[PDB]
Every structure is written in C-alpha cells, then in structure tokens.
Design a protein around this ligand. Structure first.
Ligand SMILES: *[C@@H]1O[C@H](CO)[C@@H](O[C@@H]2O[C@H](CO)[C@@H](O)[C@H](O)[C@H]2NC(C)=O)[C@H](O)[C@H]1NC(C)=O
Ligand SMILES: *[C@@H]1O[C@H](CO)[C@@H](O)[C@H](O)[C@H]1NC(C)=O
Lengths: 49, 50
C-alpha cells in the first residue's frame, strides 16, 4: 500500500508507526457540587443601565 | 584595520638562488565532515498527534 505496487523489491521500507491505544477513559473533576445561581441573573425582574 | 600578513620582500636577482639545506617533517590536521544525523519524521503524528 505504501509503495503503490503489488511487487515489492528487496529492501527495508518505512511504512507506519506502532502505537498502543488507550484502554479506558478517566474524567477527573472537583468533588465539590453546588447548585449554580443562574436564576439570580437571568430571572431578575430589573436590570441595570 | 586587519593585517593581511607579515611583510616579506623576496631578495630576487637574476643570478641568485636559495637552496634548502635542511627540512622539517610537518604533520597537519584536516577535519572533514562525512555524515549527518539521520532523522525520520512521522508527518501525521507531528502535525496531528492522535
Ligand atoms: C637539521 O634540522 C634538525 C632539526 O629539525 C637538526 O637536529 C637538531 O640538531 C641540534 C644540534 O645538533 C640538536 O640540539 C637538536 O636536538 C636536533 N633536533 C632533532 C629533532 O633532532 C639538525 O642538526 C639539522 N641539520 C643540519 C645539517 O642543519
Ligand atoms: C422566575 O420568576 C418568576 C416570577 O417573575 C417565577 O414565577 C418563576 O418561578 C421563576 N423561575 C425560576 C426558575 O426561579
């Protein structure tokens, strides 16, 4: 596939790169959980100038 | 201003010759590069990684 030919001559050929794949996904976030006050911003009856 | 070299006036005349009476066996160094560092680049993993 690299040489675009069905007959490959004698030699050593750089073809691709080996790489070990990741096995699982880990997500690390802060443990603190607080309900975020978006209601004070967007549901306010009066805004400023 | 740089000095090009030492002044040396050769005593030329039409009937005088200078003949060496001795010699020095001089060894000198000449350094010549031959090869480079052989490098290989994975183009996809350089540009994009994974
Ligand atoms: C030619 O030159 C050599 C040196 O290149 C002379 O040899 C030296 O001679 C003196 C006096 O005899 C010694 O003190 C040195 O130790 C010698 N040096 C070496 C390296 O051997 C030699 O005498 C000269 N010959 C002539 C005919 O001029
Ligand atoms: C937003 O305010 C209205 C009154 O202006 C209230 O009826 C409603 O429940 C509020 N919504 C939230 C999500 O707090």
């Amino acid at each position: 596939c690299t040489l675009k030919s069905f007959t490959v001559e004698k030699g050593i050929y750089q073809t691709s790169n080996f790489r070990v794949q990741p096995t699982e996904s880990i997500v690390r976030f802060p443990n603190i959980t607080n309900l975020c006050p978006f209601d004070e911003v967007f549901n306010a009856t009066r805004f400023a100038s | 201003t740089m000095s090009l070299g030492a002044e040396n006036s050769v005593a030329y005349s039409n009937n005088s010759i200078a003949i060496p009476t001795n010699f020095t066996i001089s060894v000198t160094t000449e350094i010549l590069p031959v090869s480079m560092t052989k490098t290989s680049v994975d183009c996809t993993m350089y540009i994009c990684g994974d």
